């Protein structure tokens, strides 16, 4: 069995190996990469996502989100307070202000210490989930707006044609902006490219140990757990590495820098934070190996998780027994 300790693997494809996206994912899996829940892909030196980032300031962040925390430093939830619209140039100036900028630090480890000590005492503003793409249309390799669609994968594997679309999303971050513990919708893969700016630190639980994280989360968030049998689908709960280590939960960590891709694998729980002003692009995708995870994915039916149009068909076809209850949660 490849990668039996479930370590995060880092890949360096050549320009020839970067042509065929599906084939390279399957290669990484042949080496055991999925056992970690997360992999890093460093693009060949010849590749670029686009020519420059000099002309992105007029993109609109229609609904910036202020991430307000409650709890203790290592165990907290966050809620998202909507703010007035602002452009990317306006948000970058805000991120760089004295109130929001990254503090002085020695290295990534010192910054990580400061994040976990101090996050809860601040409310950073995140531009998340903005439909769109920064890949040049002429970039042919690993262009997250040109991937094979999940609907087409389900149709190729299972024979059933379904409605729905699959497009990418932009994320504009600042120091302390936070992504809560989650797996993807329908336990899909994700791919995330850090276009520019400061790093993103990730934490991940191997898929084979995901239920250990869920059982800890029910203990640490007991009211939330009574409210919903899949409350991590709400994407609001944070647990620090120190608390995970105290409770014996297997995990790994890695920092993504600008120019790098990360892939999350089906049922790989992940969480993390941004080091300073940055922009990432991410999308969900599927492979044949996903289908069995989609059929077994938990679902939130309490009403909180509210998701895209396209998840309807995935529930309806892969989980027909759950469909009626889940759709009630959507309405
Ligand atoms: O970058 C972020 O805020 C969150 N991204 C992801 O969870 C992802 O790419 O799967
Ligand atoms: Mg612009
Ligand atoms: Ni994710
Ligand atoms: Zn719920």
Which CATH number fits the domain that encloses residue 225? 2.60.120.650
- This structure was determined by X-ray
C-alpha distances in angstroms, 96 versus 124, 281, 293?
12, 21, 41
Q: What count of other Cβ atoms lies within 10 Å of the Cβ of residue 117?
A: 12
Resolution (A): 1.4
* Ligand at shortest distance from the CA of 262: 1
The verdict on the CB of residue 264 being under 6 Å from ligand 1 is yes
CA 19 to chain CA mean position, Å: 24
Could you tell me if 199 and 256 are in contact, meaning their C-beta atoms sit under 8 angstroms apart? yes
42: containing domain:
1-331
Please tell me the residue having the least CA distance from ligand 1 atom 2.
179
Tell me whether residue 275 is annotated as binding.
no
282 lines ligand 1 (CB under 6 A): yes
Q: Is 192 a pocket residue for ligand 1 (Cβ < 6 Å)?
A: yes
190, 200, 269, 271: residue to mutate for ligand 1 pocket, most atoms within 8 A of CB: 190
Q: Are 298 and 318 in contact (CB under 8 A)?
A: no
Cα–Cα distance, 307 to 242 (Å, whole number): 31
User: 23: helix, coil or strand?
Assistant: helix
Longest dimension (CA), the chain: 55
For the stretch 292-296, contacts whose Cβ atoms lie closer than 8 Å and that sit 24 or more positions apart, written own/partner, are 293/186, 293/187, 293/266, 293/267, 294/186, 294/187, 294/188, 294/266, 294/318, 295/319, 296/187
Distances from the Cα of 331 to the Cα of 303, 311, 324, angstroms: 8, 14, 11
Are the beta carbons of 151 and 245 closer than 8 angstroms?
no
The number of domains in the chain is: 1
Task: Report d(CA 275, CA 316) in Å as an integer.
Answer: 39
- Residue 326 contacts by C-beta under 8 Å, 6 or more apart in sequence? 299, 301, 315, 319
Which ligand places an atom closest to the C-alpha of 283?
A: 1
Q: How far apart are CA 302 and CA 328, in angstroms?
A: 9
DSSP H or E run through 77: strand 75-82
The two tokens of residue 100 are: 């929001």
């Amino acid at each position: 069995a490849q990668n039996p300790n479930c370590n995060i693997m880092i890949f360096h494809p050549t320009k020839e190996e970067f042509n065929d996206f599906d084939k390279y994912i399957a290669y990484m899996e042949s080496q055991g990469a999925h056992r970690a829940g997360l992999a890093k892909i460093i693009p060949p030196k010849e590749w670029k996502a686009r020519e420059t980032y000099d002309n992105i300031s007029e993109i609109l962040i229609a609904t910036p989100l202020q991430q307000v925390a409650s709890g203790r430093a290592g165990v907290f939830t966050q809620y998202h307070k909507k703010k007035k619209a602002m452009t990317v140039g306006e948000y970058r100036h805000l991120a760089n202000s004295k109130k929001y900028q990254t503090p002085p630090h020695q290295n990534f480890e010192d910054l990580e210490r400061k994040y976990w000590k101090n996050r809860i005492y601040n409310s950073p503003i995140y531009g998340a989930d903005i439909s769109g793409s920064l890949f040049d249309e002429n970039t042919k390799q690993w262009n997250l707006g040109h991937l094979g669609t999940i609907q087409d994968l389900l149709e190729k594997e299972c024979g059933v044609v379904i409605e729905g679309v699959n497009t990418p999303y932009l994320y504009f971050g600042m120091w302390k902006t936070t992504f809560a513990w989650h797996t993807e919708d329908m336990d899909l893969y994700s791919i995330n490219y850090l276009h520019l700016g400061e790093p993103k630190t990730w934490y991940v639980v191997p898929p084979e140990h995901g239920q250990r994280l869920e059982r800890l989360a029910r203990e640490l968030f007991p009211g939330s757990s009574r409210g919903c049998g899949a409350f991590l689908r709400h994407k609001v709960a944070l647990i620090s590495p120190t608390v995970l280590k105290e409770n014996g939960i297997p995990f790994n960590r890695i920092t993504q820098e600008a120019g790098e891709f990360m892939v999350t694998f089906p049922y790989g729980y992940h969480a993390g934070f941004n080091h300073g002003f940055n922009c990432a692009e991410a999308i969900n995708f599927a492979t044949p190996r996903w289908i069995d995870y989609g059929k077994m994915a938990s679902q939130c039916s309490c009403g909180e998780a509210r998701v895209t149009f396209s998840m309807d068909a995935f529930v309806r076809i892969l989980q027909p027994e759950r469909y009626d209850l889940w759709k009630r949660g959507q309405d």
